[PDB]
Amino acid sequence: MGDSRDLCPHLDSIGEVTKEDLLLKSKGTCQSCGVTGPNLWACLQVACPYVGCGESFADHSTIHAQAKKHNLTVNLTTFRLWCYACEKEVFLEQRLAAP
Numbered sequence: 515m516g517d518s519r520d521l522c523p524h525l526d527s528i529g530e531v532t533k534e535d536l537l538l539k540s541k542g543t544c545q546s547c548g549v550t551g552p553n554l555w556a557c558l559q560v561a562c563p564y565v566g567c568g569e570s571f572a573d574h575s576t577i578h579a580q581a582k583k584h585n586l587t588v589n590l591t592t593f594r595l596w597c598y599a600c601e602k603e604v605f606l607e608q609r610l611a612a613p
């Protein structure tokens with residue numbers, strides 16, 4: 515059972531992809547559009563390594579969450595998540611600290 519608000523429901527189903535994955539994803543460009551770093555949004559499912567765009571370009575965040583039904587993604591622009599399911603933005607459950 516999940517809890518707290520920052521912690522999203524599907525956030526526990528995505529497990530924890532490779533941290534560095536969030537680091538290369540933050541490389542600076544969409545992997546399918548090559549648009550830029552700011553306003554990027556890479557998928558964050560237990561098994562979906564790909565850095566999509568944010569409206570900034572075509573927002574793969576939508577068609578990608580729309581095609582793969584993946585709701586959670588992380589904006590390497592501000593460091594938060596986005597559940598196309600809970601349809602909102604969320605940061606690490608904060609339960610952790612000084613990682």
Ligand SMILES: [Zn+2]
Nearest residue numbers: 522524597600
């Ligand atoms: Zn969710």
Ligand SMILES: [Zn+2]
Nearest residue numbers: 557562582584
């Ligand atoms: Zn995905």
Ligand SMILES: [Zn+2]
Nearest residue numbers: 544547567574
């Ligand atoms: Zn894209």
